[PDB]
């Protein structure tokens, strides 16, 4: 019910947190950039389950 939207709301929060951390670390010297990658999920049904 609510899970299809709650999963997307939770998966778009780390996609802001990694950008916030990359912005805040823009002046240290041994820093490497951060990217996140998503992938959907299915059970044995035919509708989705979120992100």
């Amino acid at each position: 019910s609510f899970s299809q939207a709650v999963s997307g709301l939770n998966a778009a929060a780390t996609n802001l947190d990694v950008i916030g951390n990359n912005i805040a670390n823009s002046a240290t010297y041994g820093f490497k950039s951060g990217t996140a990658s998503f992938a959907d999920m299915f059970a044995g049904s035919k509708v989705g389950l979120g992100v």
Binding site: I19, I23, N25, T28, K32
Partner: peptide
């Protein structure tokens, strides 16, 4: 060594 974080590519992902 500097920090390889491009501001132009992270300010348009927010």
């Amino acid at each position: 060594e500097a920090s390889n974080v491009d501001l132009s590519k992270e300010l348009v992902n927010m």
